[PDB]
Design a protein around this ligand. Structure first.
Ligand code: NA
Ligand code: NA
Ligand code: NA
Ligand code: NA
Ligand code: NA
Ligand SMILES: [Zn+2]
Ligand SMILES: [Zn+2]
Ligand SMILES: [Zn+2]
Ligand SMILES: [Zn+2]
Ligand SMILES: [Zn+2]
Ligand SMILES: [Zn+2]
Ligand SMILES: [Zn+2]
Ligand SMILES: [Zn+2]
Ligand SMILES: [Zn+2]
Ligand SMILES: [Zn+2]
Lengths: 363, 367, 367, 363, 363
């Protein structure tokens, strides 16, 4: 079976927060709104004013940066009798909103204030230990009902977060094409459709066409068409691509890197970018394609060496540990269309570092 | 100003998918009304009920009386309420599917659609097309959400008459051209905003899949079998085209199709057959280059879609009849105003009459 | 050494433009003599006078007696003077238009030309071609200014016989080749200088539009309708070709056309039909590569322009007749000396006889 | 309706001033010649000697750098019974000559001594307030009867003025193609013909082929074929292109910039060049096309950043005012094939500045 | 009529001097050998030994670096009853050998010891005044009977002379194509054949393919296949090309430059190279083709600016004199397919200088 899944509706544009009530109303007439105090300050009057205009009841919950904040927000929801969840903010908030909605069986509307990972459209949350190490992929039975991306808010967030989202999105084509070639099963539970693979590719093509242009707009805090295209790339295209087409070596290498303390200060997408580079070596991509990805990463500020990732000195045994972890049973690296072992992964990573360092020398 | 894309929750496709429907349906509900006419129940009923039983899903079969009318809808609503069903399954052709969407809408329950033919891109959409009883386009009726799940059993589809696959390729054929015209016009889609890059790209992928795979798939289905080409065309006729048209946009070809519904001579051709010709007429309306017209003429001729008025049953001095088609295609609210330029009845008449001439000259060169 | 481009003040085109002529004519004068033969008055008279009335423009109709002769010109001059008209409108075919240019010239008044056919590139030019009564080229007669305004009603043109559109494409066909030959020779145009980049580019755009749009437009006009392809060809046959030939240059093809006017066998073919063949002969004269000859042969054959002496009515031992064509094409003052190389009657005869052979071999392969 | 308009005759070449009498004679036998004292010194004997040779009467008027210099020259014309107007010199003179000819209903011959804007062929004059702010486009019912470009005179004018004319001409293809795509009405009053759009494109292609070569010739004060092609581009091609094919965002942005005091020292064409760059961002042109236009502007000396335009420091509110003004009702920016708002314009301008500044860094 | 002329036989290769007797014998059994003392020292035993081996009589004449050295060698020839002339050495010697052979009506064999101009195959000598100014082209009724190029000798001559020969050969395609386009009459007396034009083009293509490679070989004093190809290019291809296809602006500009004292220290071919560049401007070649010729000239050491030609300061009036002279009645510049005047030539030269100086800046 080929299977594609999607949120029911993805909405994007400048000041989309002021139009939320009209779409949210179609799903429920009473929401719990989960957001931290800083996001409530930026977004709360706009959002609450939209909800009121369309006759939607709302209760805002005190949220702070655990299955137990989830339980607590679960009880508060029942207490006020809410029929719906809105999450507003960064990843932890959106993840908590998906969990609450799931455990209560209610529709969920997600409103990301940054475009830094492809997580929001997905029926998935990534769980980490207390020490920051990858633990597991937690799969929910449904995608979010609705994802709303306000481009004006996103373009005012720190540019480094748009760049991180592009690093996450960079892996999508490469991972999806490897899975496709391998006939691997996606998280959606089948073989990839043409549709998912094609959005994954459009993701990559869009990054190459719009990445720099968008970065320059976001540095000035403004929304151009290039920014809208990258937000779409970073969020819808990447999200469908990864979940319905598949994950492979780049994400498994990211997860491996979480076992080193030295990289905990990088964003998810910065590490996936280097993991993508390592994958290019693992699958023996042609030098021209390595050059394209190195130039794109350098041009926008993604890491292309182990030193840029905070890993210095003789890294050989550290990267052995990263490789053992990226090859654990269950990991997505085994969706590659060839057999992969820790030794091959360590070799791909160490070589990618040399290729990125030689590139820096030439530039 | 907002870009919006909508989609069914899950689209599932492959050979003998009907036998696996229970795992997927179970995730939405444990009790379904199954709407199917008698021919479809005889064809698919034992496999489907078998699958449902095997996954602990309860089910009441209900015999569909062929037509998608408020009466049948209200009737099936009451029946559902009386056995306590928590979900609807539609199985079969377009009228059965459109009925199941409405039942699920009014009862506010989840719906699983199981098309047994791939002859239109309707199944994934939050939409039904209402005609009159005389067969004349009435209205687009729009639901506020898409079907939860669409299941395409490719083995079943490949045993259906090849003419129905061709008609679906005909409907799919318009998708790119209408989507790109809307995109160019900055027109609003049925999803309620400007097109995403995603919906436009799926629409283009539709056109490109038809050109790569359409003949190969037609040959396989003529033999009654499923190859990868058939799997690709079924995706193209269903998911790619369905998202492309709903979330990217309709334009001249479907408006021209609607306009042809005022002529009795056509009224029994399949929707996608007429839409193929309407696509040709759109090419003349927007002045596509000759190489692109040639490509489309060769595709339609190679798979068996009409490229002249005579193949649509229309002959003689059709000047007045085509002016009637043209007026109807330009009615207020029609999708032809989504073109990136001003369209008038006279321009539409011109494009139709000229498309006929192009296709007739192409037939005379045979190729 | 000077580059010069000249142009009508305003060129206006589109469907039902005749009904809007009053706004534009009003800007030049509030009182016009309207010169039209009776057939044209019956076809276009009520729309035109209607438009003029609606914008407060006064008008006296004058019946044109078919021929562009000093007598008719002097006559229409007197009539104008007697009602006090402050402008001339010419409506219809070439002889009507050439007459209106002369009337406006002698009376020193503004002129609006309304061609009801698109069969030559004459309308925009500061020019008239004088023949003898026996049909034999006499002289280019040159005015010191271009018509003020040229109005092309595409709806009217698309109802005229397709053969007249084809003949205009035939005339337009020579434009690029003659312009580029002149440009290469650094020859002086009828505008009085070397060609601008603008006039050459319009001439090339003419050729490129014919190749892209010519068949599509022909098909539409065979159906009696206006599509965008027809709008493009009408611009190509009229504005692009008219500026190209006047401000960029004439060369062998039109000189060869003139030379053919000494044979009775041709004398009733349309100007553009003969010019198409003269273009072919120009291709052989300048040794165009075979691929370019093929392209032109396929274009002329596909739209119905002559590619052999027999299609121009000439048969048998035409050795002497073609030597007479060749001598006349090389007369002192003819445009064939604008070629970027020395041309003699023997070379022209060679090019003609050889072009006939090329076109006859092409006909035998049918394609 | 598709409509194209043109002057009746455009004449160009080296020492074309010495041949003027032969063409002017065809229109009238007695002219008022309007020119400042410096232009009279350069051009007057050549011109007056040509007029005499062909039996053309002439009276020269004292002209100085207002509807009232127009009225005064109007009365002087009647006083001597003149049948014709010749304007010789820069834009203000040519504009005054068009106005006089119009109010008196006589033929006009224009003789530009610089090739710095595409105004001369057109039936249009741009009106500004006393403080230099764009006021309105004033449309006359006729184009000039004749435009005469003496290339020897033009090639001796300061090169910075040829460069400015190239900046004005740079916008023409982009603006015409946007209008064409939008099915916008031109100043000629219809939809664009194929002819006008095609001259607009030829304009752009000519600039890219001949711009540098012409600039180098004009730096030495001489006329080569490249100079003749750029003069034609800057004057005939651009003039037909803009008037008969259409204006769009680049000119509207130029008009916006006139509300800042900081840019009043740049020529019209220098500001249109940056406005063209901003338009490329607004319409999301591909990076390759941005690179081509950035390299061309840099290569000839047109501005590619807000600092090169004299706008320094935090420009954000200043560019907001430029964007509000470029979007006024009536402005040509609404001929773009998509909806445009002040926020989008401000974003395009600020981003174009970042793109031009990044380009400078690489060069 | 199309007419091509050629020497009867062209022979080339390493140590070709040692095989001369076998070819010279076919024409006559007794030669006068004209050569200076330095060339006699290098070449004389090899040559005289070859002549002896094939039963050819020989008398060597005292030759020194005028119609009167020609008359004197004329009488000495009769005195010894010689049946043939061999010239060995540089241009003056070969020119004197052609003159003697002509006035005595005997066969002539030319043996160039340098490959610095395309003169040797031709029926032409260029005459200069005492002050070094171009005087006239003197056309003989016959080409030389035989030209023998010993590549080993040539590759040991100063590299600067191979480079000069490449500068002369650089003009050949451009001049021949201009004449062809103009339907100009060549010195052979008709229109160009296909053959001559095609050798002219092969000349240019060979220079671009082999020029650098040959220069590097000749810097080490050795013969590779690239050297053989450039010698052929510089001598046979260029010689047939220029004489049978035609001369145009580049040579006329060279002749113009002979009126300035400042350039008398450059070789013929160094000045023709810049004259070629000026011609590229005169005919408005595309920038890409200008770039190719600038890079080739720079790469091998030909001049691309007036300063490299020794012309400094304000050159404007000097270049006016060069342009007047290049346009004299009779000059080849009128074989261009467009009218040419002194002003246009001065403009082409001054602009070419600016283009060459801008190129130097970028490199
Ligand atoms: Na990803
Ligand atoms: Na469709
Ligand atoms: Na013509
Ligand atoms: Na412009
Ligand atoms: Na040479
Ligand atoms: Zn609540
Ligand atoms: Zn990720
Ligand atoms: Zn039930
Ligand atoms: Zn359809
Ligand atoms: Zn009257
Ligand atoms: Zn003609
Ligand atoms: Zn006066
Ligand atoms: Zn401007
Ligand atoms: Zn002797
Ligand atoms: Zn030479």
């Amino acid at each position: 079976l080929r299977i594609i899944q999607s949120p029911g509706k993805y909405i994007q544009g400048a000041n989309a927060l002021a139009a939320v009530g009209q779409y949210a109303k179609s799903l429920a007439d009473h929401y719990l709104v989960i957001a931290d105090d800083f996001v409530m300050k930026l977004a709360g009057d706009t959002l609450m004013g939209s909800l009121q205009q369309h006759g939607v009841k709302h209760h805002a919950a005190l949220f702070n940066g655990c299955h137990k904040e989830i339980d607590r927000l679960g009880r508060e929801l029942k207490a006020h009798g809410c029929r719906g969840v809105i999450g507003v903010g960064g990843g932890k908030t959106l993840d908590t909103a998906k969990a609450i909605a799931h455990y209560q069986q209610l529709p969920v509307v997600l409103i990301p204030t940054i475009a830094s990972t492809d997580a929001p459209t997905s029926a998935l949350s990534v769980i980490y230990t207390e020490q920051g190490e990858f633990a597991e992929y937690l799969i929910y039975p449904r995608n979010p009902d609705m994802v709303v991306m306000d481009v004006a808010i996103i373009a005012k967030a720190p540019v480094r977060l748009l760049v991180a989202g592009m690093g996450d999105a960079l892996s999508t084509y490469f991972e999806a094409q490897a899975c496709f070639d391998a006939q691997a099963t996606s998280m959606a539970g089948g073989k990839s459709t043409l549709a998912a693979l094609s959005l994954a590719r459009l993701c990559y093509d869009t990054l190459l066409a719009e990445g720099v242009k968008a970065k320059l707009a976001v540095e000035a805090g403004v929304v151009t068409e290039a920014v809208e295209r990258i937000i779409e790339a970073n969020t819808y295209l990447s999200g469908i691509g990864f979940e319905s087409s598949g994950l492979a070596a780049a994400h498994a290498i990211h997860n491996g890197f979480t076992v080193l303390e030295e990289c905990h200060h990088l964003y998810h997408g910065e590490k996936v970018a280097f993991g993508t580079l390592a994958q290019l070596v693992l699958q023996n991509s042609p030098m021209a394609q390595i050059e394209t990805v190195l130039a794109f990463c350098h041009r926008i500020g993604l890491p292309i060496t182990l030193a840029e990732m905070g890993v210095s000195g003789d890294a050989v045994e550290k990267i052995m540990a990263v490789a053992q972890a990226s090859c654990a049973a269950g990991e997505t690296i085994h969706n590659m269309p060839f057999k992969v072992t820790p030794a091959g992964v360590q070799a791909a990573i160490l070589t990618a570092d040399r290729l990125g360092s030689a590139w820096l020398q030439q530039h």
